Amino acid sequence: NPIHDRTSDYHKYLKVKQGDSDLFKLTVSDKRYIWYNPDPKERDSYECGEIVSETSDSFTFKTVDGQDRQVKKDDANQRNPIKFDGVEDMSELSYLNEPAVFHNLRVRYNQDLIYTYSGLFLVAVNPFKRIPIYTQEMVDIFKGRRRNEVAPHIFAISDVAYRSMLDDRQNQSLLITGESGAGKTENTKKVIQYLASVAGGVLEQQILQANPILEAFGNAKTTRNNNSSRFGKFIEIQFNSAGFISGASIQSYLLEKSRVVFQSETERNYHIFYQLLAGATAEEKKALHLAGPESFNYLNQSGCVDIKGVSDSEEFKITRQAMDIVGFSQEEQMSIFKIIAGILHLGNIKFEKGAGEGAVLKDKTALNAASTVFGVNPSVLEKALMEPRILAGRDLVAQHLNVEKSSSSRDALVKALYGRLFLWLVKKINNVLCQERKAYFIGVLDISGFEIFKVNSFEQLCINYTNEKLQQFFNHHMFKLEQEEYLKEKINWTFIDFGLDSQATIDLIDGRQPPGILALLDEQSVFPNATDNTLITKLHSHFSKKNAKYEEPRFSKTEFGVTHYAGQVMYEIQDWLEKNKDPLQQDLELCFKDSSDNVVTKLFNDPNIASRAKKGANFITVAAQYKEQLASLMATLETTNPHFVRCIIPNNKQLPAKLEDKVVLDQLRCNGVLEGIRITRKGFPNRIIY
Numbered sequence: 001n002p003i004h005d006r007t008s009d010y011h012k013y014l015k016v017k018q019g020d021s022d023l024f025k026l027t028v029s030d031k032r033y034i035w036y037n038p039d040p041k042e043r044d045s046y047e048c049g050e051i052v053s054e055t056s057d058s059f060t061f062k063t064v065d066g067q068d069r070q071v072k073k074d075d076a077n078q079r080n081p082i083k084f085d086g087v088e089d090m091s092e093l094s095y096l097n098e099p100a101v102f103h104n105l106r107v108r109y110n111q112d113l114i115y116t117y118s119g120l121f122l123v124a125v126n127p128f129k130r131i132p133i134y135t136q137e138m139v140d141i142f143k144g145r146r147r148n149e150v151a152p153h154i155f156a157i158s159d160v161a162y163r164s165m166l167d168d169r170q171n172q173s174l175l176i177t178g179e180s181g182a183g184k185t186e187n188t189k190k191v192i193q194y195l196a197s198v199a200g201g202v203l204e205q206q207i208l209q210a211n212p213i214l215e216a217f218g219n220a221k222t223t224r225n226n227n228s229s230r231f232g233k234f235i236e237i238q239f240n241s242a243g244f245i246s247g248a249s250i251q252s253y254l255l256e257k258s259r260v261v262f263q264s265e266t267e268r269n270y271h272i273f274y275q276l277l278a279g280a281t282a283e284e285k286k287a288l289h290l291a292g293p294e295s296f297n298y299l300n301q302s303g304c305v306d307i308k309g310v311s312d313s314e315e316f317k318i319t320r321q322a323m324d325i326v327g328f329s330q331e332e333q334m335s336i337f338k339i340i341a342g343i344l345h346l347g348n349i350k351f352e353k354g355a356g357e358g359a360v361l362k363d364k365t366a367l368n369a370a371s372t373v374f375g376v377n378p379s380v381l382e383k384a385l386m387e388p389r390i391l392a393g394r395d396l397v398a399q400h401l402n403v404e405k406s407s408s409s410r411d412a413l414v415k416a417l418y419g420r421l422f423l424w425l426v427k428k429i430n431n432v433l434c435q436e437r438k439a440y441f442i443g444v445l446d447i448s449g450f451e452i453f454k455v456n457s458f459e460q461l462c463i464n465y466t467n468e469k470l471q472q473f474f475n476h477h478m479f480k481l482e483q484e485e486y487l488k489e490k491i492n493w494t495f496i497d498f499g500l501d502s503q504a505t506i507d508l509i510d511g512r513q514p515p516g517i518l519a520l521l522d523e524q525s526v527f528p529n530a531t532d533n534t535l536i537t538k539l540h541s542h543f544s545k546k547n548a549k550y551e552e553p554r555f556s557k558t559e560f561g562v563t564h565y566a567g568q569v570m571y572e573i574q575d576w577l578e579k580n581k582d583p584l585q586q587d588l589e590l591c592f593k594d595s596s597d598n599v600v601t602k603l604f605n606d607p608n609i610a611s612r613a614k615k616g617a618n619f620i621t622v623a624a625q626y627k628e629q630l631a632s633l634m635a636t637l638e639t640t641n642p643h644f645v646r647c648i649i650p651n652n653k654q655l656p657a658k659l660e661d662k663v664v665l666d667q668l669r670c671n672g673v674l675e676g677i678r679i680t681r682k683g684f685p686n687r688i689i690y
């Protein structure tokens, strides 16, 4: 049994290594220690001092510099006896405080033990390096083993959820939290690998091949993650009454399609673009009129076209192979790349001013190239771009857009093409994975993590609000409902205020009465004369000096701050109305509806992809679509028994072996980890009726 064999990889990679006789001597010591702040200004930088004396209400200890300080016992962060250093479940620590919890994670992290239990939930610190703990041999070890019988691991919590699904005949859910780059997507994959194995000969393989496809079109390099998921997703692993995998369903959420036409410095567009250009055959390059990434406006503005340690040519091959195993016709696959190539050409179209204010198109090389691969008439497309037709009452009037507006319309077409292609890809995949009515399922949530950039827009607000909601879901299940049970069954429990509540922030963003940020956003979206300026003025009017989670900065007139659980974020109001309205000239849709290409035709004719719901007189806004998907997720989660995994980023440099206290402690605090451990200790978790 590898579990009890100190020579097995299991012991080598999942257990804390045996300490020596020298460590043993320190472990049996009678001395007592305390964690203190050498600098009262740097509260997260701790040192270990020895307690030399005490009074009825205080300790006197020695600092590293051989000095002496005193502290009241009530404010003291005592250090746990070192026999606890490396403990697998921190609910066991005698002293539960920030430096103690951080120290234990540090001790384990220093030995590449990234998983640690914090009572009922799992904590996972991103190693930013490969660790051999995800092999089939590792999967077999955890199979059917109780949590307390094996080391902490993403596989263990997956197995527990699986057993609970069978033991209770209840749908389960794995909620993996974390800011951008913390490890959510990596762990999500592990969960699926493990379940596919223990409950699994072709379906399971296709289920696995679904990710590399989604990531190529849905992931991209941002300043916080080289493989940032730019769309969130809820994955349903479906099982039959017997407990066998009967299928899988992928619920994808809104994609950051604005990235296709713009990327901040040092970031990249979606991976696929680089994979195609770098992995396409010499013939494909001629047929699609491809060239180097530096040749395309949509790829040569960030100053970055490659990711260290990543081969786009090699990744392309993996994507293609994934597309094959899932079942994408060689025809479909080619159309997909034509769309990708077409998008690139569209981005190269340079509009110029004519004799008048209207724009003209002198060079038509790119226009012609795009029309070619897309299978649409270039003259038509050209007219639909610079001279779209609209109704002026009931009259049909041909517009003549200037350079700026022509460019924006061109970007709108691009974003719609990509966003729809993504929906199409997910749809196709679900057809293959969905072929049997399920009896149960385990849902794995992998949303885009909390993120902050120099410039935060509408997308970031929605992303961070999602993270705000998931954290509230954790607070609710861990603290609210927990104590609600105690007081319901009344076991002489006095309510405890854990101080974790994101309701105020949530109300500020999605509140109905009074109306929140999104509500006002939509309101301004229908107001015929509204501008981004009138929008922010409206927001300031409602929340400046009125909502404690809102801030009207004195240093800017185009930004507003929102205090999230993970920190305050300043949002730039530029383009919010257009992003929310998400317009597209009908003449462009008519142009592509007549495309000779099958995939393209499907993207503009398939209602469930091309159609857009109407909020009465206007088309449903993106904020409205957002709210709908969120509500849908929350409702689903309510029909499941949740399991939480808290992913923790070690630093902000994507470097291994570099655990920074400040970075880690802020996450431990806003995640409610210690409070989570305290409720498990002070309360009564498991309880069965008579």
Ligand SMILES: Cc1ccc2c(c1)C(=O)[C@@]1(O)CCN(c3ccccc3)C1=N2
Pocket (backbone or CB within 6 Å): 230, 231, 232, 233, 253, 254, 255, 256, 257, 447, 448, 458, 459, 462, 463, 466, 622, 626, 629, 630, 633
């Ligand atoms: C349940 C839910 C609801 C809405 C969401 C998400 C998840 C995401 O993570 C998304 O994919 C992540 C990015 N995103 C988004 C981006 C731009 C505009 C609107 C939404 C998302 N919104």
Ligand SMILES: [Mg+2]
Pocket (backbone or CB within 6 Å): 184, 185, 186, 227, 228, 229, 447, 448, 449
């Ligand atoms: Mg991710």
